């Protein structure tokens, strides 16, 4: 009766397109802010962020004001969308097809005229992910917000603390705040500057996932890549398990070209690891091959050069601690052991190049063991957020 | 002619604005319920559930009644969306671009008021998956309804049991229940408090398919990979049939990447069985390694460490039940057959180290057997469901 | 002229809520069918069938008559949506994000008040897909239409038997028929019972193209797999040859994955059959092994057993057709002559031992032949389709 | 001025539901045509053509006339949709799920009343794709259109020459024309006929992406396969490489499952051909299997076959062009002679066997390179425009 | 006060339908503009580009016109779709499904009756992606604008200088210019000719991301097979790592599917680059087989041609810098004498034939290093914009 009665009232001469303000000179005071509810995903390959927000707006509508005592019980009234005037507030960096995601919903007015609007919706935004530290990265993704259409000299924008309290974890990302910033910019487009509301929500990546499914695996298969130092070369697979480690390795750099976007701005950390990896992996099989030619070679080919004969069998090979008738007859049996004598030369020689591959081994098994320890960790640690995170997450 | 009257008698005058109740004070009763039909989909790298439901709203609108004597035959009439006054009940923890995927249809309304309204739809709900105990996984899915913009001193919301009689089963997922709970919380926003609904889909995920795709596949692959401790080492395939073992394992990873998120709360059952799977795996290749080194060990190298002449060649090996011109003729006779001689010792202790091999090859046949019944066993009876799932699902 | 006039005063006093009867008391027959006009596609995985369909809808509109003498030449008029009654016929078991993938037109009635009304869509209908006997498999995929808000006392709906006279074939898909039945069934949220019309779309699956793709393919390198009865030991390549085909193997197992729904209310013929295929590659494997421990056996280990000596090497290899200083002198020559008499017997007994090898070679390529022709045609013919398939599409 | 004047007269009276016609008996006539801008895509996998097209219908409202020398400078009007009458024609073999593609521009009309009406669209449509010749294939998509509710009393469909002066060439495909046709069809739903306009888009597939990326790698990898037959067997790889390079081969087959649709109306040419190619390698592969059971023929087994002495060793190989004390003394140097002997027989009798692999290696060198050289001519030249293709293309 | 009796006296007798000129005679004048605030997507499969754009369109409107003397303070107007004439200037060659990506937002018009109107949308358009350079390639996309229905003699059309301040690099593309250009076309449709305005979007790719992921990994790959003529021919692996590598090669391959369109146009230079390449890898396996036919070459078959034994073991080889009873005993022991002499003439014959493959080996590392440092350098320096990227980009 009395619900009845204000809604025919509040409608009588209302126009959705007048601003609704007492004094047309002075701008109308919008107070903006959000609730986030949920961090939906985060598409560094497209560069977009998709979030459940209740973006909140208040202002004053000066028509929409009645006596409670006049209209006993009725002490707040809804409008939908169309009905009421309302700030065209829109995402400016907007990443959605239909470039406005929001879902319009009622705007609660009460007795004094204050209106509150929070509309729900799932908003896309195109936000530059920074991928030079990934997967320990922290990304600072903005949410701009701003009437499209109405100037400072119109809407006077306020920005309000961004709520939390409801927003509900992830596993993927932890939260580490979402401070907000009101500017006042010019365009080009008009002479009446523009203010908007811009929401930084700053966001550290938890790295337990990608760091079991990525960096510990990839860093135990190249571990497996080291096992061709200890592999005798009699065995026939040294190449074969060293090559095929190696373009196994390969499907990591290609989860993370899955992941990762197609820019130049800069090189991920996951792929400067991942890249000198394989080209650890890589020399390995470079120096199998030396050390298949040294155990391969020809006895009555090059002599060893002295340089070699030395620098590894000496003092390499030290550090590791390593280590009538019957004269025709003698002319035939002679000739024989002198045959045998020959084989057994050979394979003297055939011996201290086997030995020779055998101190390459181990030489480039502790090299390329303290390369990949080197590189690995320096490379790990080069990130500023690597101790938060093994700190945080492990 | 009686169904045309009351049509037009029942519009003179009413808003689709005003909230239907006679006393504006008091709280309108919203009884709130669902009929759960399917469960279309669970996308657990998305953290979305996908259902087929039919949302129950019944409430009393006090302008929409007639007496039927007066309009015989006339004993319920039908409104489209926008005529008549609805509750606004929305989905919170929505996961749909449009947020809001309810499709509209009429609402059913008798002669004493009493108004009846279920529309369809497919309904995408954030939904949080604990994939810790997957495949052997049950979840808990929150589908929280509640009016946006009506608090709790205007729309009293109250909870109906879930009708689940016309439910279509799944075949992934035994639904093990839909408790409802009615909540009155606080926000932020606001200062009258705001009630919702909030019905919890708890699923059993159904194990027979993962089970026979992912855990017995995996299970019998990982079994060839022991067959390289049965192998013999003259083959010169071990260190293939390893390798290519363990690259081949990678294929169920990459596949549960597919399926889990990239989230860091936890570790699935499943990653760590695979995983552990793996470094079992990893460590028989490591193991084979060791294998070719103890059998192309060269008979002039190192000589054999009592440790190891005992603790495998007495011990272990018994525990597995294994066990003028004449003269200068002589000289060079000799010498052919002292070679020989020579040739035999190195071909007795190059023996004694393939020996040496075989038992390992034994004792990790042995030993990695265990550790894969043991692990396989305790990471999948580590799961709380897994009786259960056993007995319902083979 | 007439046109204009009619139009006109079919609209006066014409509300489009109100049920177009003439005794408000008596049901309104709605006679429902459809013309199929495509099977668009068959979602296996997401158990969706989308199909292209002219819902076709006859009713009478008791105020939509004119006399034909008094408007010369106008013998039809059509009505857009929202300007006439239109019955509310949703299809129940919608699988569309949107629930209603219907494609409004006019309603086209005559002078009589004979209402049509022919909606296209593209409609997408949760379909149960019994994949037990893919791909041999018959599909019977219910669209489900039903009035939803009006029940048996308002809406009489009456089936009309489905059209196919333009039905477009597919490809993969042979229409067996679209035999429909009207129910009247009960509902738990309302009293008045609820009609609907099922048409059962049951489709038999055309087989060459998935037995050209999946079956045959598998059967061939499945075929390669044997060869490793027939290879060598001495080639080195068998373990290889035989990991290699069973690892390539798995490829068909993922494209059945990536078709199949991840269902646990049965086993897919095509996965039994794979999966059968692979152990038996599997087993070849094992008994790979098996072989090259017996090719590979040191002579001086082990004796031979008499189980084996008689079950190889008698009767199964007969059933298959196999079959003072000279002095000095004559000592060391004579253990020259000893030692190549013991590397005789070594060959002898290393050649024994490779004969078992190779016999249980062919008894594996036997036996290992015939239970791949058994379980490949004892597993394909348990389909009850097979012959009609075979027969059809061969 | 005259612009206002005119367009509040135009809209007196007028109602969008009636066809524009002066006499209410005769047909209206209605020109349609298109403008063909772009083929956007051919989802040969899901049947669908996707086009950008400007349909054009014209016709002539009997209504919209005015005289321009009352409304100087007034010589066109414009009109949205839903405020002037317009045919319904639909894309009757639509593939879109909204099933309606087209967007709704103006109809600019004349003073003399001649309505022109030209909506751009993306229109996809269900068109059977003849995969049979593929990637040789010609396609010929129809784009049936109609008006869904008007027959042929009533709108006398007409058709207009297709518009290509403004395509934009594609590719991938070449325009081979537009021909259209008028038909006059009965519906089984209804008495009175439904005229409708078919456009069908010939369209010839560009070979030299296909052929690059499909064909010819296909036939060097399938080249690198004959490599096996000049390789020697004591390298140890023969199988290896042959085994890899068949399992590499169904990359191929893998992209075009990804291409190609699940039908089994016909087996497209690219699946015969490497289907073939398969085969042919296939069976280079279990001729490598019976050549290494030539070389690796044990000495002491069955003796060689005549029919194999002949059929190999003496024609084909000529085709090729290949080709006391002193006496204990003596008995056991001369059992060491005559087992070396012994030794140089059997080594004659495996060098022959290893003569009879080598010429079975160059007679299936030959054999294998002859087939594949046929097979590969004989499939493509098979398709009739292998012809065409190769001039144009090449 | 002001706003709201202005809003009320600007809709007096306003038709949203007529064109806002005084003079019908003469055409409007639109100014037409965008602001290009970032390049979202390039889909080169396709062929569509994804940009966030302001479109930019001011004319005046010679009804909204207020003197602000008699309005204070109400300088400005806002006016939401369908209530004011707008442009419809629409994006001709879209590829959007809508085919109208534009968002809908007010137009600003002042005292003087300029209106302004600055749509966002996130626009899809048809764009030609020439191929032929890639990955250092200039893209040329022109966005083409138009009013849809009005021609010259009524829209006269202007184009404004592409606005780029707010304009946020990309990552993979460097904005190098949008400059536009205004034509004045005919059409086949119609006689008045109409203006529009193409904007061409000039956009170079960024060529560090792709040639760390594409063209290095390649080339560094590619350079792991030239390893196979280091490798010695009795590690046995040689054909197992050129077959490797090669089959390795062909992801790049796949991924530049992945990533290229279907088109005939021409041949990408990643294509060229890529196939060149795999054909160099694929001759040193065919190398790698001639290399194994001299190693495993019979002594007793056929003799070396002079023609080898000079033009390898003479020059290349030397360019290259590589270089009664007594008399039974004597008959037995020559016998066996002699035999190790011709078993040292075969050694020495197989000997020269090794050698022959060694410096084969060497000849072709050399020549297929030089083929791999021409063919890659003289491709990629082929592109004009090679330098500008690699001084840029590195
Ligand atoms: C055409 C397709 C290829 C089909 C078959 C393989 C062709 C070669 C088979 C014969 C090998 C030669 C041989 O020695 O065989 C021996 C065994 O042979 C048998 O008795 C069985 C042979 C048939 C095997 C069937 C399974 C094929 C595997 C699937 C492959 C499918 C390929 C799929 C294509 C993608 C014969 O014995 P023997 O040596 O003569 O004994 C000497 C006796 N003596 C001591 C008295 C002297
Ligand atoms: Cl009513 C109408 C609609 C479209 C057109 C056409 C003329 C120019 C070129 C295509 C389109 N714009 C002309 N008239
Ligand atoms: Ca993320
Ligand atoms: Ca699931
Ligand atoms: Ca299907
Ligand atoms: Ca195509
Ligand atoms: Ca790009």
């Known amino acids: 009766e009395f619900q009845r009665k204000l809604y025919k009232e509040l409608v009588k001469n209302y126009n959705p397109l007048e601003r609704p303000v007492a004094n047309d000179s002075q701008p109308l005071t919008v107070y903006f802010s959000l609730s986030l509810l949920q961090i939906m995903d985060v598409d560094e390959k497209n560069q977009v962020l998709t979030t459940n927000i209740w973006l909140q707006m208040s202002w004053t509508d000066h028509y929409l004001q009645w006596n409670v005592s006049e209209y006993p019980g009725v002490k707040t009234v809804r409008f939908p969308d169309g009905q009421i005037w309302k700030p065209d507030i829109l995402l400016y960096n907007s990443a959605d097809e239909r470039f406005d995601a929001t879902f319009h919903t009622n705007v609660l007015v009460n007795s004094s005229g204050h209106c509150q609007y929070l509309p729900p919706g799932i908003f896309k935004s195109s936000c530059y992910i920074d991928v030079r530290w990934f997967p320990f990265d922290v990304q600072h993704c903005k949410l701009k917000f701003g009437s499209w259409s109405y100037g400072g000299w119109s809407l006077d924008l306020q920005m309000q603390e961004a709520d939390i309290s409801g927003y509900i974890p992830n596993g993927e990302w932890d939260l580490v705040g979402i401070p907000g910033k009101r500017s006042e910019r010019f365009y080009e487009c008009c002479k009446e500057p523009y203010p908007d509301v811009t929401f930084t929500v700053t966001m550290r990546r938890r790295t337990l996932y990608y760091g079991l499914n990525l960096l510990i695996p990839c860093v135990l298969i190249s571990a497996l890549a080291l096992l061709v130092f200890l592999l005798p070369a009699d065995s026939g697979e040294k190449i074969s398990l ?74 390499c090979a030290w550090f590791l601690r390593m280590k009538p008738d019957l004269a025709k007859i003698l002319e035939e049996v002679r000739y024989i052991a002198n045959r045998f004598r020959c084989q057994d030369e050979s394979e003297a020689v055939c011996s201290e190049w086997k030995f020779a591959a055998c101190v390459v081994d181990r030489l480039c098994l502790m090299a390329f063991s303290v390369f990949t320890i080197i590189c690995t960790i320096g490379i790990l640690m080069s990130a500023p957020n690597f101790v938060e995170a093994v700190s945080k997450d492990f």
Do not use: C
């Not at 290609?254 to 000198?276: G, N, R």
């Not at 091959?289 to 002295?306: A, S, W």
């Open 242 to 315: 060293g090559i095929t480690v190696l373009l196994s390795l390969t499907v990591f750099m290609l989860l993370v070209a899955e992941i990762m976007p197609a820019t130049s701005d800069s090189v991920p950390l996951i792929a400067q690891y991942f890249a000198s990896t394989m080209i650890i992996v890589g020399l390995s099989v470079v120096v199998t091959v030396i050390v298949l030619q040294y155990h391969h070679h020809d006895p009555d080919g090059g002599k060893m050069p002295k340089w070699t004969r030395v620098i590894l069998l000496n003092w």
